[PDB]
Structure 1
Amino acid sequence: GPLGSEGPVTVVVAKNYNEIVLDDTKDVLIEFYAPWCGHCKALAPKYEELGALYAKSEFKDRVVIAKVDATANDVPDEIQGFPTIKLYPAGAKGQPVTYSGSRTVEDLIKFIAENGKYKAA
């Protein structure tokens, strides 16, 4: 099946992230998690749900839910806890927005609306 070809699930590698995140034309949300994390294993499935929901909404060309593991190369991302969330707003990018702690997609969407201009006003 698609499993991403539709848009919800998107790949973000060291050689790609720089592009999507730097893209001011559209907003991008790259989340760093791990399978063996234990507390992040849920972040994966939780991202797949919000991805298909937000993707179906009327913001396909406004915000894109991108997932990625925090075990890649050329990725200078120092964080306290694995469940790290990097916010990159379209137009006001250039600064990696590091969250304080994940738990539910509901908190992610809300925040993006407070920090992201595309999901605000």
Structure 2
Amino acid sequence: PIEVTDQNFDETLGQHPLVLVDFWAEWCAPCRMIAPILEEIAKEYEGKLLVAKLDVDENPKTAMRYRVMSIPTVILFKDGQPVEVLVGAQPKRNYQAKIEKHL
């Protein structure tokens, strides 16, 4: 699980096939809840998926870009292009479902 920033967000996206981007903030409790879940996700799909984390407090223009207004927001990118969105703090199986739809 790596960090993405306003500078390298587009590099990372065009550099990897499948990228799961977690829009989060340090002060958010449902963020903290899915955080260990998303790295089990990272392990499970270690070779076909890159998990990235976007701090919306440090990267407001990136959050503004995709209009991420409420977090635990997870967006799936399939070829630099967004294909799935998960808006709540959710069970691991819900992420697994949308990842495998594009595997």
Deviations for 1:13-40, whole angstroms, at most 9, x for unmatched residues? 11111112233x5211111122311221
> Between Structure 1 and Structure 2, which shows a larger proportion of strand residues?
2
Residue 65 (structure 1) aligns with:
51
Unpaired runs of 5+ residues, structure 2, are: none
Root-mean-square deviation over aligned CA pairs: 2.2
Q: Deviations over 1:74-117 (max 9, x none)?
A: 31231352111111102xx4346433433122211211222x2x
Larger Rg: 1
8 A contact 2:41–2:92 mirrored in 1: yes
TM-score (norm 2): 0.77
Q: What is the TM-score of this pair, normalised by structure 1? A: 0.67
SS of aligned partner of 1:42: helix
The equivalent of 2:26 in structure 1 is 35
**Counterparts in 2 of 1:79 and 1:102: CA distance versus 1, 3 Å:** same
Residue identity over aligned pairs, in percent, reads 24
Counterpart Cα distance in 2 of 1:14 and 1:63: 20
- Contact 1:33–1:43, Cα closer than 8 Å, also in 2: no
Which structure has greater helix proportion?
A: 2
Helix, strand or coil at the partner of 2:52: strand
Candidates 15, 27, 43, aligned match of 2:7? 15
- The count of corresponding residues between Structure 1 and Structure 2 is 100
Q: Distance in 2 between matches of 1:111 and 1:102?
A: 15
Distance in structure 1 (CA, Å) of the matches to 2:90 and 2:2:
21
* Structure with larger RCO (C-alpha < 8 A, sep 6+): 2
Gaps of 5+ in 1: 1-8
* Structure 2 counterpart of 1:78: 67
